[PDB]
């Protein structure tokens, strides 16, 4: 788990897996509870773009 922490921030996380929109589902699930901006920083994604 601690090693896998590195790859979350990267923009090319789901490189081989089918879902290329996993980050945008983690946001839509946990953003309310833990802050959309915080999830954006953890997943490296930018909200505006």
Binding-site positions for caffeine read 18
7 touches 25 (CB < 8 A): no
Enumerate the known binding-site residues.
18
Q: Which two tokens stand for residue 43?
A: 């997943």
Residue 10 or residue 28: which is nearer to a copy of itself going by CB?
28
10 to 39: interface string for a copy of itself, x by CB under 8 A: ----------------------xxxx--x-
| Cα gap 7→11, rounded to integer Å | 9
DSSP state of 35: -
**In the complex, which residues of this chain contact a copy of itself (CB under 8 A)?**
32-35, 38
């Amino acid at each position: 788990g601690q090693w896998d922490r590195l790859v979350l921030n990267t923009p090319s996380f789901p490189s081989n897996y089918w879902d290329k929109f996993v980050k945008r589902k983690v946001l839509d699930k946990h953003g309310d509870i833990f802050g959309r901006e915080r999830i954006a920083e953890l997943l490296g994604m930018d909200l505006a773009s």
